[PDB]
A paper describes a structure:
Two extracellular carbohydrate-binding proteins, LecA (PA-IL) and [name] (PA-IIL), are virulence factors and necessary for adhesion and biofilm formation. LecA binds to d-galactose; [name] from the strain PAO1 shows high binding affinities for l-fucose and reduced binding to d-mannose and their glycoconjugates. The genes of both [name] lectins lecA and [name] are part of the core genome25 and while LecA is highly conserved, [name] shows sequence variation in 15 amino acids in [name] compared to PAO1. Despite high sequence variations, biophysical characterization uncovered that both variants possess very similar glycan binding preferences, although very surprisingly LecBPA14 generally displays 2- to 7-fold higher affinities.
Additionally, a direct contact of these hydroxy groups with D96, D99 and the C-terminal G114 of the neighboring monomer is observed. In the fucose-containing ligands the C-6 methyl group is embedded in a lipophilic pocket formed by T45 and A23. This latter variation in the CRD, S23A, allows additional van der Waals interactions between A23 and aglycones of the Ca2+-coordinated carbohydrate moiety. In each of the three LecBPA14 complexes, the carbohydrate ligands establish one water-mediated hydrogen bond with S97. In contrast to LecBPAO1, the binding of methyl α-l-fucoside (2, Kd 202 nM for LecBPA14), methyl α-d-mannoside (5, Kd 16 μM for LecBPA14) and the H-type II antigen (15, Kd 199 nM for LecBPA14) revealed reduced enthalpic contributions to binding compensated with favorable entropic contribution for LecBPA14.
Numbering used by the authors:
A (entry chain B), B (entry chain A), C (entry chain C), D (entry chain D): 1 to 114
The structure:
């Protein structure tokens, strides 16, 4: 199945934060309604934050996360969880190799903000 | 029900990251096996990161998040989600007032690292 | 926080299924747009299905689960999870006593159908 | 990523329930520590329950769900959600055709029981 794609409510501010846990340098691409709006590039084997930004979901609400290492697309896993029918988390893990820890880049999307 | 309490595998490193979205200064206490190991204090209405640390779950694996604003306990909501039977997110939201956005402090715990 | 309340897309068919794990007879009330549309009454200490029905979320999309045992409201826990940005689960546990297993009535809501 | 594989606590009773939403007849295979312990076969386009059993997780706690239609493996999506650090749901969807609704067989695993 496709992973890393989420439908947010329209015109909503959201946070996106990425962490790295790999020998490989991670590139996280964030798209909103099919346009790249953020890029995080970094490397850590100890969960360093490689980016955190506030974005708007726009008219369409479509948010897509892609992860690559040296140009190779990482395999993604994702889900959305809603707490108290209002607090949302869109969650991504990614795997750049074959150990299947799925933490090589970890991406957390959160809304609402403010 | 009690919220903000999670059982991690023993002696395992985990990331804890807190975000703020409130007029109130947030205090996030992180306890491992019933002892405070970290406290994050900060203020933001724009999802600023008020703390991010790597911690160890210790022998018992018990991790508890408590949130307060000027000595008043916030109401917590939480859940744990596991992707691909391997990547874990323990998620906390909190409410310090009456609008019920539950984002006033948001805490994300992730494991494994590395 | 309020638990057991979920916002579904309007005019959408959904499944609701309840399981019992308690000495006490469970009465699960399902409200759609603030009107009772199903009542499941049963008893089991071994996960018997006490109801499974197809319902419609109607104009407003509001679904609420309440559980009582001998007329006393059980404490609820809940969350929603979405897989592949499409497959939805709204999940409820309930506690009728002091052992905090939260499984005394378990309620699973799933959509879409068909 | 591999989907439909879950680690339960050892030697633990759990519920497994399968629902169908497809023109295709669903065959759901349940394995405990790499051996089949149940098979559910049925058809519905209205969320009928095609199986519900109580099973034991065995010494290793490994539970796997596989779904096929007329011998063809369905694509799976899955996650586990834990409420109140106690109440567990392991969730599977599956897709047998081209519409990507992932509901064609839906499997819910719940524990603890009792
Ligand atoms: C080469 O493998 C990459 O780096 C290692 C240090 C591990 O983090 C592994 O999960 C990652 O996929
Ligand atoms: C006074 O209320 C607090 O501050 C506001 C600016 C909002 O973030 C609200 O959610 C928060 O509870
Ligand atoms: C009296 O307590 C009720 O029945 C027992 C058999 C247990 O299922 C317990 O969780 C439940 O709350
Ligand atoms: C042929 O397609 C199968 O049957 C249809 C009635 C739908 O349920 C579709 O999701 C399913 O994959
Ligand atoms: Ca890896
Ligand atoms: Ca890694
Ligand atoms: Ca608030
Ligand atoms: Ca707020
Ligand atoms: Ca109980
Ligand atoms: Ca019980
Ligand atoms: Ca389908
Ligand atoms: Ca279908």
């Amino acid at each position: 199945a496709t992973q890393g794609v989420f439908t947010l409510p329209a015109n909503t501010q959201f946070g996106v934060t990425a962490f790295a846990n790999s020998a490989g340098t991670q590139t996280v691409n964030v798209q909103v309604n099919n346009e790249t709006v953020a890029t995080f590039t970094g490397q850590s084997t100890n969960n360093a934050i490689i980016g955190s930004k506030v974005l708007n979901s726009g008219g369409g609400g479509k948010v897509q996360i892609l992860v690559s290492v040296n140009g190779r697309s990482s395999d993604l896993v994702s889900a959305q969880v809603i707490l108290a029918n209002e607090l949302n988390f869109a969650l991504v893990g990614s795997e750049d190799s074959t150990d299947n820890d799925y933490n090589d880049a970890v991406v957390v999307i959160n809304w609402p903000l403010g």
